[PDB]
Amino acid sequence: SIAVIDATVFMGMHHSDPEVRAQSLGFFGAFYSRQVMMSFGQIGICDAIIWKKSRHLQDVYYPFMDVLHTDMDIQRQGYCNKVLKRACLEPDRLSVEKRLLVAHVVEHQLPFYTHDDSLRELGLLKPFLKTFPASSVFPENLQRLYEQSMEMTIGKEDFQHV
């Protein structure tokens, strides 16, 4: 079953917390040769965070994000009807994107990776939450791009206000 990630995993590669960054980088080192799913919404959240940064920071960061999405088999899709119906029957607290994301993970019983504390606490998600696998983690040129992009820093405040 294909692994699901959200924007906190993707942007976590640039987190100011070294442990969060190590976890995100460990996931991508282990899954770069494999398949991963991100929703359209999770992709937009990433951009909405980045487009508020300086022109210089966007310029050094996006080449890394772009080559990663191109060279890695990241499956970018929307939610299906069954998932929408499940989200509306949920009782809650959580934004709409998060409810759809939870619905998608549960409906398809997919392994799920996330740094989002508001999702890691959810009993409904704990049978699908996976432990993050455990430096130089990409093919070399992507690694060069990542290094240049590390000027860009991501923190918990980025996700609160997007």
Next chain:
Amino acid sequence: MAEASIAVIDATVFMGMHHSDPEVRAQSLGFFGAFYSRQVMMSFGQIGICDAIIWKKSRHLQDVYYPFMDVLHTDMDIQRQGYCNKVLKRACLEPDWARLSVEKRLLVAHVVEHQLPFYTHDDSLRELGLLKPFLKTFPASASVFPENLQRLYEQSMEMTIGKEDFQHV
């Protein structure tokens, strides 16, 4: 400045700026020319659809395209947000949108719930009776950007978008 009737666009309007059809392209450019200094709303999902389309293009085409998109999103006040709980509930209850994707259902629910002016090239949306009271005529068709962004746009025009690019995504 915040507007009560903020204009809502979708990916077909944004990507329409690079449509292979010159007519569609002139209309989309006409839109961004008219709204460059105003508020416009795009959902996280519509933003993701634009990227999903582009990341299937060649490395070279992405590289000449994205500088235009990123500078536009930076310098224009495009309001990037998710949907609210009332919009989700409406998208589930609407029993006659089973033919549309989840994202389309949410987007139409957003427009209808908040009664917003909606711009789209998506024929599957323009026939929805509930949507017709909110569909807007595109401003007069189009150089519409400041000089630097204009140059980025012309470099980006090596990248062409097709009607079919919105089918696969």
